[PDB]
Amino acid sequence: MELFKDIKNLGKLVRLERIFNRESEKTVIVPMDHGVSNGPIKGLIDIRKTVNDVAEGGANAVLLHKGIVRHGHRDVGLIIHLSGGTAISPNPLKKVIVTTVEEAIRMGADAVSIHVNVGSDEDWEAYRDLGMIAETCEYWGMPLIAMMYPRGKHIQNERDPELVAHAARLGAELGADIVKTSYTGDIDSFRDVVKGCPAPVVVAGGPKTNTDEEFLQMIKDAMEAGAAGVAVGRNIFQHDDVVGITRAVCKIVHENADVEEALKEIRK
Amino acid sequence: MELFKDIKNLGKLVRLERIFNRESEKTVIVPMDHGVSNGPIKGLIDIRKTVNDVAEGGANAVLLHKGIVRHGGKDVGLIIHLSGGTAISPNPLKKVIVTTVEEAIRMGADAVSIHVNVGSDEDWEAYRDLGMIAETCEYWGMPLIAMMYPRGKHIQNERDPELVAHAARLGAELGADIVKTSYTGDIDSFRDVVKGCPAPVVVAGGPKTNTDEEFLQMIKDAMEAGAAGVAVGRNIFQHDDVVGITRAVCKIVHENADVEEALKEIRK
Amino acid sequence: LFKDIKNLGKLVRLERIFNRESEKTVIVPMDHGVSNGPIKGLIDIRKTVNDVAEGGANAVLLHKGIVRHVGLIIHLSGGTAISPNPLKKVIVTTVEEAIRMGADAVSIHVNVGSDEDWEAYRDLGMIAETCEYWGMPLIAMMYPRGKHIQNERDPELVAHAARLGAELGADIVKTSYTGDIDSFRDVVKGCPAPVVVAGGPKTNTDEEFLQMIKDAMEAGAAGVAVGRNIFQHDDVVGITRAVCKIVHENADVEEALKEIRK
Amino acid sequence: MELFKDIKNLGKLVRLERIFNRESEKTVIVPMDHGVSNGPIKGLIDIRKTVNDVAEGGANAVLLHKGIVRHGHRGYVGLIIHLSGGTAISPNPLKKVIVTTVEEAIRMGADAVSIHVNVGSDEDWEAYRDLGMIAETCEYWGMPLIAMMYPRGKHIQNERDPELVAHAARLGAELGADIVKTSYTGDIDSFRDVVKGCPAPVVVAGGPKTNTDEEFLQMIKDAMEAGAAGVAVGRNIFQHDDVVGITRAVCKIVHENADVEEALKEIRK
Amino acid sequence: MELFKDIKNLGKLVRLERIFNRESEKTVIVPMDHGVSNGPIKGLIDIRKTVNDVAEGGANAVLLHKGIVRHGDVGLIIHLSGGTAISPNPLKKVIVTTVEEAIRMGADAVSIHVNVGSDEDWEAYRDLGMIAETCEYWGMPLIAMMYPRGKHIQNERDPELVAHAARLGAELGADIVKTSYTGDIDSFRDVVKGCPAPVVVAGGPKTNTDEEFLQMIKDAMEAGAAGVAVGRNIFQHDDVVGITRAVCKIVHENADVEEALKEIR
Amino acid sequence: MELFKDIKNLGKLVRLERIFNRESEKTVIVPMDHGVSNGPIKGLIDIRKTVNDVAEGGANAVLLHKGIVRHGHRGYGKDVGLIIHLSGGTAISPNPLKKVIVTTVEEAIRMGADAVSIHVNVGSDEDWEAYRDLGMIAETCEYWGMPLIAMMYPRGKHIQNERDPELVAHAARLGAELGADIVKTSYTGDIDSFRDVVKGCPAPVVVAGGPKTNTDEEFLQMIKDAMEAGAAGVAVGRNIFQHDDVVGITRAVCKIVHENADVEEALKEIRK
Amino acid sequence: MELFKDIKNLGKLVRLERIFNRESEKTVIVPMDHGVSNGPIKGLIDIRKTVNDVAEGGANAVLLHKGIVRHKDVGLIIHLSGGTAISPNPLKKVIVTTVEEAIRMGADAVSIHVNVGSDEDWEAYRDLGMIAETCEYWGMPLIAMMYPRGKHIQNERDPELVAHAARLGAELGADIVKTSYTGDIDSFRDVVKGCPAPVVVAGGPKTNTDEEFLQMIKDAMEAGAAGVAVGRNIFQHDDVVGITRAVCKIVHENADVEEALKEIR
C-alpha cells in the first residue's frame, strides 16, 4: 500500500489497513463525535442504528468518544476521539484531552483522533497536546488522525485557502499520520492544501447541504484535488437514506464514480 | 439485569448491583454532599441520623464526601463524591476534584460521583476531569455517576430541555455509567433527555417543594419519562418525615405506585 | 473524642497533642513569621517555644524551617501579607517531610472565599488522603476571608468553613470564634470534626481574651489554638497556664486570671 | 461485629460484612480453588452450578481463582479471590506462588482475598514474605485477607498436630492476615488452643470427603465449640449428593448453633 | 459470538473476532514458533512463504515470535515464551516478549507456554497469572499452551494430566487453551468439559499419513474442541496450502476426512 | 575539534562531529521548520527534494520537526546530520510569539537525530515559561549526550529592532547560561556589534539567514561578515531553500563558511 | 539499504548506515571486548592504538565495553554482556551495561553474548528478548553473538547447533547475528538461510597463516555472510592496518585471497 510507504511503524500499518480500502487506498470515515460538542443532534440519537447503517453502506470506519463505544451493542474500523469541548462552554473553541491513547488501545480501536482549533484562545496548549500524543501514538503503533481547523477571534473565513493549508501542514509537522480539514471551496486551492501537507488529507463534510448534488460534488472535487478520502458526519447520518448516501460516497471515493453514477445509490 | 446487560466490566457490574433494586432495576439515591457547597444546612447537621432514617426508609444508597464517611435498616450502598466547590467562593460554579477514585475504593464505596457545571467558567477543565476519572473508574471497576448540569453566565434556565439533554449526553459520551440531572419540567422534554443519553438517567430533587404533592408528582413523571431512578437530597432529608417521605419515593420508584398511594406513607 | 477515627497512626499521634483526661487541647501556633515577618514574640522563637511548653501547652505549630533549628505540628501552607494576593495560600511543605521530622500532626490553611480558593479546596482534599495513608493527624484552619466577606467572623460563613474542612478530610478544624456562645455552638454542631478556636489579634485586657476562650469552650470547642494572645503577652508562661486552667480544668476567668504574674 | 471490634480499617469492615452473618457473627465459606491444584475434580466440573447450589444453601461466600470468576457470575454471596497457586503435578506440590494480585481482585469487585502458606515446605520463607507484603497491600486497599495456614513438609509427619497447627495460625495473624483458615486438630481441647493462640478469627477447613454426613457435621460442631469463627469447607460440600442440603446443614450448625441431629434433617437424602 | 459471551472485556472480544470464524465460531491457528526451541526446521526456513501458503489455505491466524514478525489476511498471535532443546533444561520456559510489545506491533493475541511438571514450573505458574492480568488490562486475548511434561511424566497425553493442565490454564486467566489430544474422543471430551476456556488441539509431530492427522482433528472437534493450533503437520507437508484447506474443511465446515482429503493437491 | 574542547560529554562530542566540519570546525545548518509557524511556504512544499539539494550542496545538517522526518526519503544522496526541533508556535495563533515544547528529546534520540533545537523569544508574553523549558531540556540533553541548539531571539511588544546588539547579545548569553551547546541568533547588522554577541556568549554562535534577500550579494556578504565577527557557522533557511539554485547557493555558503572564500569567489557557484 | 528493507525503524536504519558500507552492504566489525573475559591479551593492551590502526585499515566499527570507550571515523558498538574465564562458570554471561548508557555515549549499536547450552542459559534468553525490546524502542541496532557452548557440546561449530543458535537470536529480536563459521561453505550457507537476520562471522583464535584466516572469511562471504566481526585475527596480527585492509578487500570488494594478501606488509 503506497500511501504509507514511508511509515516505518509496523503497528500503525496494521491498524491503518483496517480503516483504508486496499484497492483504492482511500478511506470513508464517518465521524460521530458531535454528541459531546452539540448534544444529541439529528442522526446521533439512536447511535447504534447509525453505526449499523453507515457500516452497511460501506464506510471504512466510525469515529466515536469512548463512552459511546462502551454502550455499544456492536465489522468496520473504530477510531476513538481524544478531544473534548462544547458549544455551551464559555469558550466553545477550547478543546482538552478527555481520553488517552492507552484507553483507546485497550478497547481495540484501530486509530485515535485529536481536534485542534488553530487560532483559538490558548491554542498553543493544544499544539503541545498534539505533539505529545503523536509521540505516545508512535510508541503504541496507533494511527493518529489530526482534525486541523483555522478557528478563533481573528479568523473570519475558517475555510480560507492559506489558513486551512497552514493548519493541515502544522498537523503533519507535529506527527499526525492523517489530517482532517475543511474543503477550501475549489479544486485549485484545496490541491494546495494537499500538496503542502506531507500527510494524507481527508475532507470534512460540513453542515448538511440542501441537495445531495452539492454534497457529492464537493467530495468529487476534493478527491480530484488529491484527498486521501473523506471524513463526513452530518451529511451522512442526517440524511434520509443513511445507507444510500453512504454508498454514494463510497462510489465516488473508492470507485472514482461521477456524481451521476453516485446519485443512483440514494433511495428516492 | 437488563439495565446493564451492556456493561463489559465485571467490577462495575457487581457494584451497581449494590445500589440498584434487583427486580425493579431502578435506584433511589440520597445525595448528602450539600455540606461542602452550602455548609451545615437543615437535615445535614446530624448526618448520622439522616443516613439512618434514609436507610430505614428504603434508600438504595447515600452519597457523601470522604470526610463525613470516616465519622458516620441494615446497610445501604455508599457513593463517594469526588467534586468540590462552594457558594462562598468567588466562582461558586467552579468544581475541582477533591477526592480520588482510589481513596473511595479503599473505603469500600460502591461507586463514585463527579459534578460538572456545563457552561461555567473554564468548564472544559471539568470535561477533562470527567474523561480522565472515567478511565480510572473503568480500570478499577468502579461505577461512575456524573451529575451534569447546564449552569453558567449565559444560561438563565438551568432546566431547559435542550441544555439538559446536551449536558446528560456529554456525561455519557465521556464515560459516566449513570447520569443524575435536573427534571426539565414535563414528561415529553425529559423523555428526550433520557432518549438522547445512552446512560441511565437519574433525576435530582431540587429545592424543598412546598407540598409533598409537587415533589412526588415530579418523581412520578420523571419515572414515566424513562428515568432509571432518583437522586434526591433536600426534598428527603429536609422533610418532616424523612423515613416516611423516603418510603413514599421508593413506592413510586420501585413499585410504580401512584402519588395517591405513595403519600399514605407520610406521617403528618 | 476520636471514637470514630479508624486509623491507628492518627490515634497514636493525636494522643501527643491532646490531654488524656480532659480530651481537650491547647495549641500554640507560631507560623506568623511566614505571613507577617518577625513580629513581637516570634523573634526569639526558641524562648517562646520553651515558655509555652513550660506553661503547659500541648503542642506548638511551626513551619519546617523553624523546627530545623510538647507535641509538634508542622504547617504546610504559605502566603504573605506583602504578596499581590495576601489571601493566597500554596503548599510549601509536604506531609512526608513532616513525618520524617517526627511531627505529630500537620496543618493547612484555607481562606474560603479568596481568589482561586478552589485550588486550596483541592490541596486540602488531596493532603487529607496522603495524611490518611501516613496516619498523620490533619488540622485544617478554615477561615471565610475574601473580597466579598465583610465579616470574617460571620456566624454562618464560619460554620460553613469549618464544615467544609471536615467534609474534605481534616481531623481537626481551627477557626475564628463567632462572637457569642450560641452562634459558635452552631459552628461546633455543624462540623463533624472537633473544632478548636483561634485567638485573634492581641486583646487589650487578659479579661477579654480569657473570657472568649471560656465562651468557646462552653460552645463546645475541643480546645484552643492561640498564638499572638499568648506569645505577645507580657507573661508568656503565665498567660499559657491561665489558658490551660480554662481549657483542661474548666476553671473560670476570675480563677484563671490568677496565673498571670508581674 | 465484636469479632472485628479492632479492625481499624473502614474498607475491611465494609467488605467483611459481605461474607460474615450479622446475627451470628460467623461465616460459611465454600472454597472452590481446588481446580488449580487438583484439576477438574468431582463437583468442580460445572462450577457455575456448584456456586449456585451453595449460594442457594446459604453460604456467605465462595472462594475462587480469577479465571473462574470471569465465568461463574449468575447475577440471578461474597466473593473471595485466591492469590496462591501450585499443583499436585509439580515437582514440588507444596510450593505456592502468587498468581493473582490484590488489585486485580479489587477491580473485579471481590470482597476479600486469600493466600495459602504451607509452613514447613521447601523455601516456605518465600511465602512468609508474600504473606507479609500482601498483608500490607490489603491493609492499604481495605481488602480483607484470609490466610490459609497449614503445617506441611518433609519433616511434618502429622499435619493436624495441635502444636504446629496453632503455630501456623499464630504465623498468619502476626504477619497480618485478618482471618485464618486451618485444619481442625481432631478434638475440641487442642483446637481451642489453636483458637486462643491466634489473635485472628479462625475458620476450619473441611478436609477430604468423609464417609458419613455424621462425621463431617460433628467435626464442624466441635470446631464451632472450640471457638471457630466459622467454616471454609469445599469438598465435603460440593462433592456431596445434595449440595444445597448439606450446605443448609452446615449453616444450621454455624449460624444457628443447631446440633448435628437437627442439622442432618436438612439433608434432603 | 456465542463462544465468548462471558468475556466481559471489549478489547479481547474485538481482537478474538479476528482469530475466530464468525460462522463456525472455531479457529485454525498455525503455530510457527518452533524456530526458537528447535532451530530452522523443515518448513520454517522460508517463513515468509509458509505464512503466505497457510494464509492462502484459509488459516485464521499465525503464531510467531516478535523477531520473525519484524523481519517480514490472517490474524497475528505473538508468542511470549522461550526455551530451547539445546538448553541444560529443555523444558524450561522464560518470558522473552512482553504483552505491550505485542500490542504495539498490532498483534491480535499473545500466547504463553507452560510445561506443567517441569523443574521450577511454579515460576511459569506465576508468569501465566501475571501476564493474564496485564492481558486483561490491555484487552489482549491470551492463549495458554498447557502441557504436562517433566521428570515424573512419560505419557504426556494422559487424560488426567492434560485435563488438569487445561483447567490450570483457564483458572489462572487464559482466554483460550492449547493442548495435546489425549488419544480418544472420550478422554479428550473430559479435557474439554473440565476446562472453562475454549480448548484448541496441537498437531504434534508430522504423521505418516494425511489420514492419521486429519482423523485426529475430526475426533478432537467431535470431543468439543474450539479449533486447532497445528504447526508441523501443516508447514512440513508437501502441500502446505492444500493440507490447510483440508483442516479448514473439517474445522469450519464439519466436513469428514473423506470429503477433506480431496483438498490436498 | 578544538571549539568543543570544554565539553565534558562524550555523547555530545560524538554527535557534534556529525554536524560540524572537522577541518574548519564550522557548520552550515539548513533549518526547515518554517512549516509549523508559516505553513507550506516556497521551497518547503517538496521537502524531500529540498533536503536532497541542500545535502548535495554540502550542508552539514538539516533541522526538521519530527513529523517531516517520519515522512521521509531517508535514502542514498549524501548523508547529512539531522537536528530535531522541539519548539512549536504559529503565525495564526492569538500569540504568534508563543512557543511550547511539542517534541521530546527522547523522541529525537530514538529517531537517530544528532541534535535537538529549541526556540525562545526573549521578551514575548510569559517568556519565562520558555526559560524554564530551556533550562530543563538542557538537563535532559546533558543526560542523553544530545547536543542542544538554542535559537535565541529578542522579540516582543517593546522590541522594535530585533537585531539590536545589546538585545541579541543578552539573548545569546541567556541561551549559554541555561545550558545550550550552540546558539542560533540574528546578525546584528555590522561586524563590530556582532563580535560583541560572539564574545559575550560562552557558546559557539551560529547566524540565522533572515528573509530572502533581493540579491545573492547581500546575503553572502552578511554571512561573510558574521564569520568575520567570530560566528561558528550558519543556520540559514529561506535564503537557501527559496533561492532558484538551491544546490548552488548552498555551495556558495559552504565556500564562505568552510573555506573562508570571499563573496566574489563564492558567487561563482550560482547557476546562470 | 537493501539489506534492511523489512526493518521498520527509522533510528536503527540511521545507526546501521554508520556501521555498514553503503555500496557493498556488508560490514567489517572489529570486536575488542576480550579484555573482560580474558584480561589484557596481545593487541588489546594499547587499545587506543589498536582502534586507530583498525580504523585506518578501513574497519566499519569497533566493539567495546563502556569502560574502554570512556578512557578516520568509525562506528561504535557497545557490548552489554560480561563474564570471565576465571569465573567458576566461565560460560556465564550477565548484562553489565544498559542500552540507555550506550545511547548517551553516542554508540551506533549494542551487542549481547548468549552461550546457548550453558548453565541457566535461559536467563540469557530472557535478557536477549528484553534488551531487544528496549533496543527497538530506542532505535538502537542490536547485534546478538550466538554460540553453542555447554557441557554437552563438543564441536561448538556443528552445523545444526550453530544454525539453531543464530535462528534463536533473530527470533528474539536481534538485528544482526554474530556466530562461528561452521567449517565449510555448504553448512554455513544453511546457517545463513535459516536465520532471517544478517549473519556476520567471528574470526576465532589467531590462525597460523594469513592464508587460513583470509580463506575462511572468503568462504563465509560466499556462504552468504553479511560481513565479518573478527578480533584476535586482526589485532593480534603483526601488521594490523594491513590485515584489516586485506579483510576489507574480501568483504567490500569481493577480492580473492591471492589479491587480498597484498595489502599485508
Curated annotation (Swiss-Prot), chain C:
Please provide the Gene Ontology terms (biological process) for this protein.
amino acid biosynthetic process; aromatic amino acid family biosynthetic process
**Which InterPro entries does the record match to this protein?**
ADH_synthase (IPR010210), Aldolase_TIM (IPR013785), DeoC/FbaB/LacD_aldolase (IPR002915), DeoC/FbaB_aldolase (IPR050456), FbaB-like (IPR041720)
Q: How does activity depend on temperature?
A: Optimum temperature is not reached at 100 degrees Celsius.
What is the activity regulation comment for this entry?
A: Inhibited by NaBH4 in the presence of FBP.
What this protein catalyses is: 1-deoxy-D-threo-hexo-2,5-diulose 6-phosphate + L-aspartate 4-semialdehyde = 2,3-dioxopropyl phosphate + 2-amino-2,3,7-trideoxy-D-lyxo-hept-6-ulosonate
Q: Where does 1-deoxy-D-threo-hexo-2,5-diulose 6-phosphate bind?
A: 31-35, 143-145, 199-200, 227-228
- Coiled-coil positions are none
Kindly give the HAMAP family that the UniProt entry links to this protein.
ADH_synthase
The record's annotation in PANTHER family points to:
3-HYDROXY-5-PHOSPHONOOXYPENTANE-2,4-DIONE THIOLASE (PTHR47916:SF1), FRUCTOSE-BISPHOSPHATE ALDOLASE CLASS 1 (PTHR47916)
Family note: Belongs to the DeoC/FbaB aldolase family. ADHS subfamily.
Q: What is this protein called?
A: 2-amino-3,7-dideoxy-D-threo-hept-6-ulosonate synthase
Q: Which gene encodes it?
A: aroA'
Swiss-Prot record, chain D:
Record field: catalytic activity: 1-deoxy-D-threo-hexo-2,5-diulose 6-phosphate + L-aspartate 4-semialdehyde = 2,3-dioxopropyl phosphate + 2-amino-2,3,7-trideoxy-D-lyxo-hept-6-ulosonate
**Gene3D superfamilies recorded for this chain?**
Aldolase class I
Question: One biological-process term from Gene Ontology?
Answer: aromatic amino acid family biosynthetic process
InterPro entries in UniProt: ADH_synthase, Aldolase_TIM, DeoC/FbaB/LacD_aldolase, DeoC/FbaB_aldolase, FbaB-like
Q: What EC number(s) has UniProt assigned to this enzyme? A: 2.2.1.10
Query: Could you say how this protein's activity is regulated?
Result: Inhibited by NaBH4 in the presence of FBP.
The keyword Transferase belongs to this UniProt entry's keyword annotation: yes
User: Which residues catalyse the reaction?
Assistant: 33 (proton acceptor), 150 (proton donor), 181 (schiff-base intermediate with substrate)
Q: Name the protein family.
A: Belongs to the DeoC/FbaB aldolase family. ADHS subfamily.
- What function does this protein fulfil? Catalyzes a transaldol reaction between 6-deoxy-5-ketofructose 1-phosphate (DKFP) and L-aspartate semialdehyde (ASA) with an elimination of hydroxypyruvaldehyde phosphate to yield 2-amino-3,7-dideoxy-D-threo-hept-6-ulosonate (ADH). Plays a key role in an alternative pathway of the biosynthesis of 3-dehydroquinate (DHQ), which is involved in the canonical pathway for the biosynthesis of aromatic amino acids. Can also catalyze the cleavage of fructose-1,6-bisphosphate (FBP) to glyceraldehyde-3-phosphate (GAP) and dihydroxyacetone phosphate (DHAP).
Matching PANTHER family, A to Z?
3-HYDROXY-5-PHOSPHONOOXYPENTANE-2,4-DIONE THIOLASE (PTHR47916:SF1), FRUCTOSE-BISPHOSPHATE ALDOLASE CLASS 1 (PTHR47916)
Recorded protein name is: 2-amino-3,7-dideoxy-D-threo-hept-6-ulosonate synthase
Q: Which organism is it from?
A: Methanocaldococcus jannaschii (strain ATCC 43067 / DSM 2661 / JAL-1 / JCM 10045 / NBRC 100440)
From Swiss-Prot, chain F:
Family matches, as InterPro entries: ADH_synthase, Aldolase_TIM, DeoC/FbaB/LacD_aldolase, DeoC/FbaB_aldolase, FbaB-like
Q: Detail which positions bind 1-deoxy-D-threo-hexo-2,5-diulose 6-phosphate.
A: 33-37, 153-155, 209-210, 237-238
Query: By its UniProt entry, which SMART domains does this protein fall under?
Result: DeoC
Outline the subunit composition: Homodecamer.
What do we know about this protein's activity with respect to temperature? Optimum temperature is not reached at 100 degrees Celsius.
**Pfam families from the UniProt entry:** DeoC
- E.C. no: 2.2.1.10
Name under which the protein is recorded: 2-amino-3,7-dideoxy-D-threo-hept-6-ulosonate synthase
Q: Which family does it belong to?
A: Belongs to the DeoC/FbaB aldolase family. ADHS subfamily.
- One example of a Gene Ontology biological process annotation: amino acid biosynthetic process
UniProt keyword annotations, A-Z: Amino-acid biosynthesis, Aromatic amino acid biosynthesis, Schiff base, Transferase
Q: Where is the active site?
A: 33 (proton acceptor), 153 (proton donor), 184 (schiff-base intermediate with substrate)
| Native species | Methanocaldococcus jannaschii (strain ATCC 43067 / DSM 2661 / JAL-1 / JCM 10045 / NBRC 100440)
Ways its activity is controlled: Inhibited by NaBH4 in the presence of FBP.
Q: Which GO terms describe its molecular function?
A: acyltransferase activity, transferring groups other than amino-acyl groups; fructose-bisphosphate aldolase activity; hydro-lyase activity; transketolase or transaldolase activity
What domain of life does the native source organism fall in?
A: Archaea
Which reactions are catalysed by this chain? 1-deoxy-D-threo-hexo-2,5-diulose 6-phosphate + L-aspartate 4-semialdehyde = 2,3-dioxopropyl phosphate + 2-amino-2,3,7-trideoxy-D-lyxo-hept-6-ulosonate
Keyword Nucleotide-binding listed? The answer is no
Give the protein's biological function.
Catalyzes a transaldol reaction between 6-deoxy-5-ketofructose 1-phosphate (DKFP) and L-aspartate semialdehyde (ASA) with an elimination of hydroxypyruvaldehyde phosphate to yield 2-amino-3,7-dideoxy-D-threo-hept-6-ulosonate (ADH). Plays a key role in an alternative pathway of the biosynthesis of 3-dehydroquinate (DHQ), which is involved in the canonical pathway for the biosynthesis of aromatic amino acids. Can also catalyze the cleavage of fructose-1,6-bisphosphate (FBP) to glyceraldehyde-3-phosphate (GAP) and dihydroxyacetone phosphate (DHAP).
